[PDB]
Amino acid sequence: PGIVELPTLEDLKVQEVKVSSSVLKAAAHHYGAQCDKPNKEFMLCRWEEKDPRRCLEEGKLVNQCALDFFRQIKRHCAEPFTEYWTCIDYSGLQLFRHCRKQQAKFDECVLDKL
Amino acid sequence: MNPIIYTTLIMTVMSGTMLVMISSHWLLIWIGFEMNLLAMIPVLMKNFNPRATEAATKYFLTQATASMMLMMAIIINLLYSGQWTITKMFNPVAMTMMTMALAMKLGLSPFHFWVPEVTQGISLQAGLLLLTWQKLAPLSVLCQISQSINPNLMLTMAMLSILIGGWGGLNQTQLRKIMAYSSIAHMGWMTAVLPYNTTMTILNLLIYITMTLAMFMLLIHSSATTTLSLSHTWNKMPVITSLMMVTLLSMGGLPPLSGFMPKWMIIQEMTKNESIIMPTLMAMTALLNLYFYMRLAYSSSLTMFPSTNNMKMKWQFEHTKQMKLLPTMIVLSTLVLPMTPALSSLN
Amino acid sequence: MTMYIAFILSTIFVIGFVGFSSKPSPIYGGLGLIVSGGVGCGIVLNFGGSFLGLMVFLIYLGGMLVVFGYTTAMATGDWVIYDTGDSGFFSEEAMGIAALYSYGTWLVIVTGWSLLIGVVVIMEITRGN
Amino acid sequence: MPLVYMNIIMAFAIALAGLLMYRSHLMSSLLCLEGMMLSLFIMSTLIILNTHFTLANMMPIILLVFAACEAALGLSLLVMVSNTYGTDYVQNLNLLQC
Amino acid sequence: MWFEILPGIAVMAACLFIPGMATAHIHKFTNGGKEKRVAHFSYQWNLMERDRRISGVNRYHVTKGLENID
Amino acid sequence: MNIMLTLLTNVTLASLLVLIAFWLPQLNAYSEKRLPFSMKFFLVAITFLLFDLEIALLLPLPWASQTNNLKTMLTMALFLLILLAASLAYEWTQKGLEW
Amino acid sequence: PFFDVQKRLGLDLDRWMTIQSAEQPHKIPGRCHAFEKEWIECAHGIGGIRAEKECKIEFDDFVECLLRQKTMKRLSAIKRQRDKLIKEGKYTPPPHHLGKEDPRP
Amino acid sequence: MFMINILSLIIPILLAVAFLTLVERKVLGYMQLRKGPNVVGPYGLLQPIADALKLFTKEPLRPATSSISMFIIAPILALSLALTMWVPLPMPYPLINMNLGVLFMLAMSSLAVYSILWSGWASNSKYALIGALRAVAQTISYEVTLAIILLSVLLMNGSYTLSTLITTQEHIWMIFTSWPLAMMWFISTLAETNRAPFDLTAGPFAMFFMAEYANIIMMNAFTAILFLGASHDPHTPELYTINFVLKTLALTITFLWIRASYPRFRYDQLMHLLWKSFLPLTLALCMWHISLPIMTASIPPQS
Amino acid sequence: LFQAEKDRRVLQMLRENLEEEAIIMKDVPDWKVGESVFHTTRWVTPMMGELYGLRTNEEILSATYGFIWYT
Amino acid sequence: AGRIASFLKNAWAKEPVLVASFAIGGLAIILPSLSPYTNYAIRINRATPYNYPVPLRDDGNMPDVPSHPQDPQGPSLEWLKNL
Numbered sequence A: 001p002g003i004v005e006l007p008t009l010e011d012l013k014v015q016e017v018k019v020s021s022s023v024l025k026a027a028a029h030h031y032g033a034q035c036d037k038p039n040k041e042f043m044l045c046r047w048e049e050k051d052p053r054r055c056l057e058e059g060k061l062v063n064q065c066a067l068d069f070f071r072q073i074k075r076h077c078a079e080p081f082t083e084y085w086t087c088i089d090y091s092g093l094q095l096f097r098h099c100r101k102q103q104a105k106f107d108e109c110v111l112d113k114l
Numbered sequence B: 001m002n003p004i005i006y007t008t009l010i011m012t013v014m015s016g017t018m019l020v021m022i023s024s025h026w027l028l029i030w031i032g033f034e035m036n037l038l039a040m041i042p043v044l045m046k047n048f049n050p051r052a053t054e055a056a057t058k059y060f061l062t063q064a065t066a067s068m069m070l071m072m073a074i075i076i077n078l079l080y081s082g083q084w085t086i087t088k089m090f091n092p093v094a095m096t097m098m099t100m101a102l103a104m105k106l107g108l109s110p111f112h113f114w115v116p117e118v119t120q121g122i123s124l125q126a127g128l129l130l131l132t133w134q135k136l137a138p139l140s141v142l143c144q145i146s147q148s149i150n151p152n153l154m155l156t157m158a159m160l161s162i163l164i165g166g167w168g169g170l171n172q173t174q175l176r177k178i179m180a181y182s183s184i185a186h187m188g189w190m191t192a193v194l195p196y197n198t199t200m201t202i203l204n205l206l207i208y209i210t211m212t213l214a215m216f217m218l219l220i221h222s223s224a225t226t227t228l229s230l231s232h233t234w235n236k237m238p239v240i241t242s243l244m245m246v247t248l249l250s251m252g253g254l255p256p257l258s259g260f261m262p263k264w265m266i267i268q269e270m271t272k273n274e275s276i277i278m279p280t281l282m283a284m285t286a287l288l289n290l291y292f293y294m295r296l297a298y299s300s301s302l303t304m305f306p307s308t309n310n311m312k313m314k315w316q317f318e319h320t321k322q323m324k325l326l327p328t329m330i331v332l333s334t335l336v337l338p339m340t341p342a343l344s345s346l347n
Numbered sequence C: 001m002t003m004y005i006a007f008i009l010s011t012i013f014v015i016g017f018v019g020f021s022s023k024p025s026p027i028y029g030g031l032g033l034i035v036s037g038g039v040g041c042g043i044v045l046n047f048g049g050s051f052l053g054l055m056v057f058l059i060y061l062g063g064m065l066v067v068f069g070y071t072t073a074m075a076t077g078d079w080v081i082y083d084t085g086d087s088g089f090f091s092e093e094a095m096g097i098a099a100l101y102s103y104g105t106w107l108v109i110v111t112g113w114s115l116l117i118g119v120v121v122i123m124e125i126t127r128g129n
Numbered sequence D: 001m002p003l004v005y006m007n008i009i010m011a012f013a014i015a016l017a018g019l020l021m022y023r024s025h026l027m028s029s030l031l032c033l034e035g036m037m038l039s040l041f042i043m044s045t046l047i048i049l050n051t052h053f054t055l056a057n058m059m060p061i062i063l064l065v066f067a068a069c070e071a072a073l074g075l076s077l078l079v080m081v082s083n084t085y086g087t088d089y090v091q092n093l094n095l096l097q098c
Numbered sequence E: 001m002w003f004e005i006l007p008g009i010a011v012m013a014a015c016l017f018i019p020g021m022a023t024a025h026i027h028k029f030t031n032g033g034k035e036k037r038v039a040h041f042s043y044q045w046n047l048m049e050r051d052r053r054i055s056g057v058n059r060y061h062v063t064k065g066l067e068n069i070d
Numbered sequence F: 001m002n003i004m005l006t007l008l009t010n011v012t013l014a015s016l017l018v019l020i021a022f023w024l025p026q027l028n029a030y031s032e033k034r035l036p037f038s039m040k041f042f043l044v045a046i047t048f049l050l051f052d053l054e055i056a057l058l059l060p061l062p063w064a065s066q067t068n069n070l071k072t073m074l075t076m077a078l079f080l081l082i083l084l085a086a087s088l089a090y091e092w093t094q095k096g097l098e099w
Numbered sequence G: 001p002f003f004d005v006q007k008r009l010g011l012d013l014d015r016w017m018t019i020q021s022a023e024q025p026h027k028i029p030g031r032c033h034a035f036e037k038e039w040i041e042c043a044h045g046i047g048g049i050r051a052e053k054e055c056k057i058e059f060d061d062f063v064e065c066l067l068r069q070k071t072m073k074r075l076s077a078i079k080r081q082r083d084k085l086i087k088e089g090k091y092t093p094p095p096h097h098l099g100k101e102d103p104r105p
Numbered sequence H: 001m002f003m004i005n006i007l008s009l010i011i012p013i014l015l016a017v018a019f020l021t022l023v024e025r026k027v028l029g030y031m032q033l034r035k036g037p038n039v040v041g042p043y044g045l046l047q048p049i050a051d052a053l054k055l056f057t058k059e060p061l062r063p064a065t066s067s068i069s070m071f072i073i074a075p076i077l078a079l080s081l082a083l084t085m086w087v088p089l090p091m092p093y094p095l096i097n098m099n100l101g102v103l104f105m106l107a108m109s110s111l112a113v114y115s116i117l118w119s120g121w122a123s124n125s126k127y128a129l130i131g132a133l134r135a136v137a138q139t140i141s142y143e144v145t146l147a148i149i150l151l152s153v154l155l156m157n158g159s160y161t162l163s164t165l166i167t168t169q170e171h172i173w174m175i176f177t178s179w180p181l182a183m184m185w186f187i188s189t190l191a192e193t194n195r196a197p198f199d200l201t202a203g204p205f206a207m208f209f210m211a212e213y214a215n216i217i218m219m220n221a222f223t224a225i226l227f228l229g230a231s232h233d234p235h236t237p238e239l240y241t242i243n244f245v246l247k248t249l250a251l252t253i254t255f256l257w258i259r260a261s262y263p264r265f266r267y268d269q270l271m272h273l274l275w276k277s278f279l280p281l282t283l284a285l286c287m288w289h290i291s292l293p294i295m296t297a298s299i300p301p302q303s
Numbered sequence I: 001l002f003q004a005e006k007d008r009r010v011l012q013m014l015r016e017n018l019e020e021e022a023i024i025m026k027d028v029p030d031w032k033v034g035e036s037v038f039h040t041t042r043w044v045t046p047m048m049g050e051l052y053g054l055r056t057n058e059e060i061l062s063a064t065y066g067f068i069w070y071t
Numbered sequence J: 001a002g003r004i005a006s007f008l009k010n011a012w013a014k015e016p017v018l019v020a021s022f023a024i025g026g027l028a029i030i031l032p033s034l035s036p037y038t039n040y041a042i043r044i045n046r047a048t049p050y051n052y053p054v055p056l057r058d059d060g061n062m063p064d065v066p067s068h069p070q071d072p073q074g075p076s077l078e079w080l081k082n083l
């Protein structure tokens, strides 16, 4: 009863965000504050179309938006940010309350830079 | 037992049947069956003795097995189509399982063996309740899924029930066994018409409940549980025996009594569906039920049996307690044939 | 694949049922039923039903078969049908079971009534006389 | 329908047949009933978890509880029968007959 | 006197020291010097699986920072 | 896998230690020379079974407290506890807890 | 028989639990939510006879989602053919299916 | 290195239950104006080893007619359950991190009665069977109130995860939030392990004894984690381990103290104690602890 | 971001399976490569056997029981 | 008046556990209907996001729907912070 159309492997090639869950968690709040427009556009598209194949283009824009965000952090406060995510990456449950001192350092480093 | 506890148990039995009748979810129907069984056991053992305990354990075993296969049918139905609503079954295997579970719950042959023994074990009030109220829930469930049933299996059990009741009633001196076999035959008659018309099923159920209530109340009034104990009743209360004879004639399906109304209509309905052999066999078989009803009438009201001297003292006392609605039951179980077209009320 | 561990557990389940269904020496039948209950709890747990498997293992084994043993002593193709997504930051079985107090009010009412009636009924049945 | 459902259904059928055999020892009858209930619980849980039907996670617990109550009732009955005969043999229950 | 009960208690205490301490050190050794990751609720498990896939060595605890962003 | 291995190790150790206990003194030569059925015990077992079923109903309470329907959950949870209390009171007043 | 008390009083005693696609807690969907939704909206207000006749496509899809019989048959056929080709020797699995692939986040 | 962790959990527990006999004898002796063992070993320290060797070199008296199967099975189940109940506990980090760890421990404790039932059944004696029935009835009766008290306490924790109990008691102990529940829990754990004042009842005998003493220690450790919450610093868990071990030792010594201080109940008296004093208060305080977080808007996080 | 990665990964695995099926089913007479079993054209979430059917037993075991067995 | 006080005093003696049990259960039933923090508990439960907030498609007719999380439109949790 029909043939299931799948995008070719070339249409699924994108520059991946290759950072661990601790690094992603340490930047989650600012990443949500910054990359909100492409992320919401992708999710609105993802819930309305209800089909992975129909949103392949919008999902490539969220990868870029995230790469750009991490590039800005790298080029401005890699020092302070690396001390923050290394403290969050130590906790088994990766709690935010076990490194408020480090978070403050990285919170002042992005408000006085970006 | 305590009257408050007995009232609570009877109300719980009623609530189990009503929960079966008003729910649309298979789990809640099964829960109603469970609650009904749970509260029915003490009622059968209200008068404690070994016979009542044996009857209660037999009844519990049969009803628990039926409930397990009921649950099994529900799960199988759920696996094939994920639905909990009580409608026609989506699986053929599930339907047969459902059909046999309700056959055990009603007492249809070949699952009839428990009815005579349980009825013999319990008292007359427990027997009245068991043979009248305990048929509403399984029959209502059967009515709700009648479009799903395989006619072959269902009609096979109906005809078997009629034959078995007719044959087994011929061998009985005990009145409770006679009532149990009569109930088996009437269940067969009711279930023979589910595939075609559930209104006829309900009409037969109501007529049968009326006649069974009248018969059990008359047996309680003249506190007799055997043929010979009832043969003494003319020497104290002959009006009771006359009413009992008319009720027995009605229960045998003799026109123009009330008991002729169901079979007639049922036969009529089956003839609409080009079924001729089965109704003929059913009527010729119901002649057996009529025969042992007639034997009871001969022993009770049409001849006068030898009495005893101590009966004289019983002539000096009256019944302290009365059954209300007994006159209404007698009248409704003998003289409602002219009101037959009222069945359009979908009773 | 561990040679169909679910199939192995189901086979042990069936074998235990065959064992205690012969009804030899009801204490031995109860022991076979205990082993079968443990195996079925393992099946449910391996499937992902942690709370329901532990309910089997606690209620069934530790209370009900324990009472059965008390009374007796007084006398003389898998892995493929599974899902793809995740559950979120909760366990769906727990949320559905906890919905008993907000969604299943009617079920709570009927179950509580049935349990109270069962207490009363046991009292009345065992009164004796 | 995979083989796990087939095995659970087969276990249920084996338990039902064992209950219907009645070699002796009504306690074995109750044991067979409760084995049937255990198989029912397992298979219903498997179906409900497999189809991700959240609100039906209520159902197995309910079933368990109700069935356990029945066991209690059954046990009571068994006990009372023994008090009349001294043992729970099936063949003692022949006072009432067809 | 009463302090002669202290030796046995001490021995008992030392034994009860061994399990918990051992666990902690083992969780340091198999987890690259960090506490063993806790995975409830299956979003945590997805995080661990993503970490294991992006480590390049099939080990979730090898953390990739900005030096891997290129 | 970890839990299965742990139980296997526990059971294996217990079996090994019991069998060596039962066989170490079996290697050296030596001389090598009713009815009552109390009903109260059955009734306490049955009472435990019923209260255990009601505890099984009570168990999901820690998760039931995050529902946005706090009033209905509190009513139903309280109702179950009250229901449990009635069973205890009825059994108490009917001489069900005596010896 | 069935006395529809809930519909008369608007109670909803047990209708909340009858189907997968009825307002689950935390909006958690059933595995076959869309198929059941389609089947229900096909068969609404039509009657059981016409529902069984005219909505067989949706019901078949719903059952296929529920039990995955045809899907498992297809997968088994593919696996058996691949096994035969490996035994005889005209097929070689790629690095993807031998664990030698490059995983993606 | 998971096998090494399992072994480093099992072996030290068995040594601890071996030397708990020494500690109990020493403590009871000094409460009785005497000493305990002080001859075998420098301070009695070799007494447990001598006891174990003597027990393991003595003739075993098989009943010569009883069910040898259940006779051998009962100690296996007892000791296996005793050693299994230690896995869920977080000291600070648990060997197995279970979501429903508390429920798992409840289920293990519930199984613990099959050993009593089977040992009584396989004694081939009517009097020992009577004693076994009494023990089973007492155990199930008190595990009822254990379960109810436990869920009432956990309503302030937010889940059944035992690790979260460390998070709940970060600032204050649970003993201050509910001391009545802790009192009834302590008495119920006395009655659960058949310890005085609730002690109404070669090789395999030592196996049973090891299981009972391991259950005593585990129950006291569970009480310490449940009601006496130590502070845990993720960068030095040894502080938590030492604190938790000290509290567990204190509770075990309190068990010995209680055994040395009181007479024992009758059967009907402890049955009445439970069913007429603990159960009513347990139900009332369960109602109270259900209502409390909602009234004060202090419901714990996890769902 | 996780949703985008999940979608891309599932699509890639499905395409790899489709290509291998095209290779394997080349001599089956009545086969049609990549044929749906549903009448609808709506997207249907693949099973676990769809994605890990042709892969090695180790990662099948992972994807099936890793979260359940991780304690 | 006098009968109830006499009964309560006679129960506080020789039955203190039952008096305590009934007092605690009665308070558990009564107080939640009178506490002013239960609505706060309900609101705290409503404020815990377990699911993703699916954005709405803008049509030029949603003034109260924020266009960004930092925008003032929408619910706020200052009352939670101050609690």
Ligand SMILES: CCCCCCCCCCCCCCCCC[C@@H](O)O[C@H](CO[C@H](O)CCCCCCCCCCCCCCC)COP(=O)(O)OCC[N+](C)(C)C
Pocket: B202, B203, B206, B207, B210, B332, B333, B336, B339, B340, B341, B342, B343, B345, B346, B347, G001, G002, G003, G004
């Ligand atoms: C002896 C013959 C039987 C006894 C006759 C009854 C005697 C006592 C009855 C006293 C009053 C009862 C009437 C109930 C009051 C309200 C009824 C209403 O609420 O319910 C209706 C139902 O009312 C009944 O239908 C009418 C009952 C009338 C029974 C008498 C007819 C029996 C056949 C003729 C025999 C002659 C008897 C006449 C002399 C008394 C709506 O039914 P519905 O929920 O929508 O459909 C469910 C049933 N389905 C599933 C079959 C479709």
Ligand SMILES: CCCCCCCCCCCCCCCCC[C@@H](O)O[C@H](CO[C@H](O)CCCCCCCCCCCCCCC)COP(=O)(O)OCC[N+](C)(C)C
Pocket: C102, C103, C105, C106, C109, C113, F069, F071, F072, F075, F079, G013
């Ligand atoms: C109406 C006529 C009654 C007289 C007839 C009496 C016959 C027996 C009485 C038993 C029937 C009880 C009716 C209660 C039905 C429950 C459902 C209804 O009440 O709504 C619930 C309202 O809950 C109420 O709080 C129920 C309170 C009732 C329980 C307290 C006492 C019950 C005693 C009943 C008898 C039990 C044994 C006897 C005790 C004396 C739902 O709450 P809500 O949150 O909006 O919706 C949930 C769905 N969501 C999640 C999508 C939002």
Ligand SMILES: CCCCCCCC/C=C\CCCCCCCC(=O)O[C@H](COC(=O)CCCCCCC/C=C/CCCCCCCC)COP(=O)(O)OCCN
Pocket: F085, F088, F089, F092, F093, H276, H280, H281, H283, H284, J008, J011, J015, J018, J019, J021, J022, J023, J024, J025, J026
């Ligand atoms: C209304 C609130 C509902 C919720 C609270 C209830 C939660 C749990 C409490 C109920 C548990 C069940 C109790 C069962 C009652 C049976 C009592 C009984 O039978 O005992 C009687 C006697 O007990 C009684 O007196 C009956 C109850 C007496 C009243 C108890 C307290 C009533 C209310 C007191 C406080 C009310 C509110 C507090 C007022 C202060 C302000 C807050 C005989 O005792 P025996 O030990 O058998 O024989 C002794 C000789 N061998």
